[PDB]
Amino acid sequence: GITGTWYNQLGSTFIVTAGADGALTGTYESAVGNAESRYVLTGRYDSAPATDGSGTALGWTVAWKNNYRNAHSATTWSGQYVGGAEARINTQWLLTSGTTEANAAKSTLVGHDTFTKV
Amino acid sequence: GITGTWYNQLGSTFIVTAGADGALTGTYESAVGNAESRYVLTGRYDSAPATDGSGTALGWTVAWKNNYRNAHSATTWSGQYVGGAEARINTQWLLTSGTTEANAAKSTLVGHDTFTK
Amino acid sequence: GITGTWYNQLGSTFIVTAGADGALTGTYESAVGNAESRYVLTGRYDSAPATDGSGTALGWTVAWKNNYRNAHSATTWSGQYVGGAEARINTQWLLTSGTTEANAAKSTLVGHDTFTKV
Amino acid sequence: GITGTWYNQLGSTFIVTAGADGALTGTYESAVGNAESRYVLTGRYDSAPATDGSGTALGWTVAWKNNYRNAHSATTWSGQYVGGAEARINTQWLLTSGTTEANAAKSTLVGHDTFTKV
Ligand SMILES: O=C(O)CCCC[C@@H]1SC[C@@H]2NC(=O)N[C@@H]21
Ligand SMILES: O=C(O)CCCC[C@@H]1SC[C@@H]2NC(=O)N[C@@H]21
Ligand SMILES: O=C(O)CCCC[C@@H]1SC[C@@H]2NC(=O)N[C@@H]21
Numbered sequence: 001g002i003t004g005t006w007y008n009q010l011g012s013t014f015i016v017t018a019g020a021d022g023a024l025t026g027t028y029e030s031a032v033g034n035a036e037s038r039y040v041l042t043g044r045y046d047s048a049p050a051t052d053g054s055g056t057a058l059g060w061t062v063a064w065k066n067n068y069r070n071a072h073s074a075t076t077w078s079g080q081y082v083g084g085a086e087a088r089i090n091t092q093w094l095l096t097s098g099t100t101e102a103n104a105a106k107s108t109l110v111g112h113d114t115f116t117k118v
Numbered sequence: 119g120i121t122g123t124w125y126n127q128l129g130s131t132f133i134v135t136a137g138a139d140g141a142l143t144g145t146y147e148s149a150v151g152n153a154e155s156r157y158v159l160t161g162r163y164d165s166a167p168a169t170d171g172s173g174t175a176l177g178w179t180v181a182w183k184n185n186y187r188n189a190h191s192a193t194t195w196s197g198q199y200v201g202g203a204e205a206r207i208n209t210q211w212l213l214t215s216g217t218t219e220a221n222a223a224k225s226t227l228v229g230h231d232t233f234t235k
Numbered sequence: 236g237i238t239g240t241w242y243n244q245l246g247s248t249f250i251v252t253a254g255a256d257g258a259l260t261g262t263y264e265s266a267v268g269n270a271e272s273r274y275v276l277t278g279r280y281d282s283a284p285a286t287d288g289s290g291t292a293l294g295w296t297v298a299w300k301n302n303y304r305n306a307h308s309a310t311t312w313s314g315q316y317v318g319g320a321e322a323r324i325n326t327q328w329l330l331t332s333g334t335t336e337a338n339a340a341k342s343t344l345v346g347h348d349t350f351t352k353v
Numbered sequence: 354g355i356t357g358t359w360y361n362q363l364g365s366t367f368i369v370t371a372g373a374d375g376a377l378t379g380t381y382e383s384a385v386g387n388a389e390s391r392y393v394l395t396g397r398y399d400s401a402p403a404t405d406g407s408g409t410a411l412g413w414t415v416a417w418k419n420n421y422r423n424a425h426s427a428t429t430w431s432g433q434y435v436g437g438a439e440a441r442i443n444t445q446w447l448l449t450s451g452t453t454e455a456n457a458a459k460s461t462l463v464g465h466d467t468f469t470k471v
């Protein structure tokens with residue numbers, strides 16, 4: 001139920017395919033930041049989750065470079081797929097920008113995105 | 119520069135090749151935690167970073183399931199590679215465990231790993 | 236706008252006094268975790284924030300030790316206060332537990348809390 | 354043995370006093386970012402840690418306003434004190450800036466500092 005098109009609270013578009021091998025592949029489109037259009041993503045998920053009602057641990061990465069722009073940054077999302085009536089993917093993320101030594105202390109942003117199919 | 123074998127402060131081994139497309143592929147072996155053997159990784163990196171000496175942004179994911187165990191979790195490392203006499207990859211990571219919504223507050227660990235050759 | 240009673244989404248209760256000082260004092264009641272009753276908090280805030288509409292930066296700390304219990308852990312919330320009809324305090328937090336240096340790779344949890352007047 | 358003068362890898366200066374009741378007070382001086390001289394800090398620590406060799410959980414806040422400047426930001430450090438030969442405090446920190454609703458996705462930085470007495 002992870003496969004498909006999801007949207008986060010910012011309006012970004014997350015188009016994913018969950019592979020039988022635990023592979024996550026698709027595209028990301030950010031509604032904010034130093035980005036336009038679609039970027040390649042790749043990630044992994046637990047292809048055999050618990051059955052105690054636990055959610056499904058997953059992760060994916062986007063390097064913010066494509067044919068039109070390069071922000072010299074990468075975001076990783078970590079969280080879990082929670083299926084059911086209201087399916088949702090709950091994440092926290094790290095966005096690291098390429099910096100010089102002077103700026104490394106402030107290289108990494110952290111946040112949380114919530115994805116739904118609606 | 120990135121392709122190769124890397125070790126972090128915990129004794130884990132990160133084996134990756136950086137494709138020219140900006141794909142990261144490889145294998146991760148953790149020294150600690152609910153793990154044993156190798157796990158598949160995949161990620162992405164800035165295959166055209168700035169010329170000013172900034173580092174190279176990158177990220178990768180490991181779900182902790184292989185033929186041996188399944189921790190029912192995934193880690194994502196977000197960082198940058200820095201070349202030099204001492205090449206380094208400095209990261210921050212998020213380790214999320216599957217949980218019921220009751221314990222979702224405690225699902226996600228945060229940490230930092232430094233990789234070196 | 237900061238002083239008073241606030242609630243997050245776990246149902247925890249945050250009772251603060253914002254000192255002229257830049258001081259934050261109060262008590263925290265957490266709904267979830269190895270917790271019981273009220274705990275002392277202390278923190279700091281920008282007592283001269285931007286006029287330009289930006290939020291009011293703040294942070295606080297709770298060590299989870301009181302008369303009833305001691306979880307040997309500490310949470311810090313970092314965030315910002317946002318005035319308006321729906322006042323909110325939007326935070327990210329770090330929960331560190333005391334561990335041996337074996338398990339220290341799993342000592343710190345991260346998450347986010349949104350506090351509302353209701 | 355938390356009271357005293359500590360330095361992190363950036364060469365910032367962390368002067369702290371741990372009171373009986375679990376209080377933390379002191380002064381923080383950053384070697385980096387939008388800061389100059391000392392800023393008041395405040396926090397909490399577990400005043401009755403385990404004895405199994407586990408470290409002492411602690412956390413503190415700095416709002417980055419003093420008589421010289423104001424960055425409209427606040428940093429929290431969450432971590433633990435670890436005694437012995439190499440007495441150190443290992444932390445993770447969250448640095449939130451006051452932003453408008455629009456740029457809140459980039460309000461929060463994350464990092465880690467290691468404090469030593471040398
Ligand atoms: O600004 C950049 O460096 C690239 C764009 C980053 C957009 C971020 S990734 C985390 C968050 N979630 C989104 O949908 N967009 C932002
Ligand atoms: O215990 C688990 O749930 C799976 C193993 C996680 C090990 C972590 S991932 C971050 C850190 N870096 C490492 O090399 N190992 C730990
Ligand atoms: O160690 C424990 O379990 C006690 C910590 C309290 C639970 C956490 S603190 C962050 C989050 N926000 C809350 O209101 N509760 C949890």
Ligand SMILES: O=C(O)CCCC[C@@H]1SC[C@@H]2NC(=O)N[C@@H]21
Pocket residue numbers: 105361363365382383384385386387388417424426427428446448464466
């Ligand atoms: O907003 C600002 O730039 C002032 C924040 C101070 C810089 C930070 S706090 C985390 C890190 N550790 C330090 O000793 N300094 C930086």
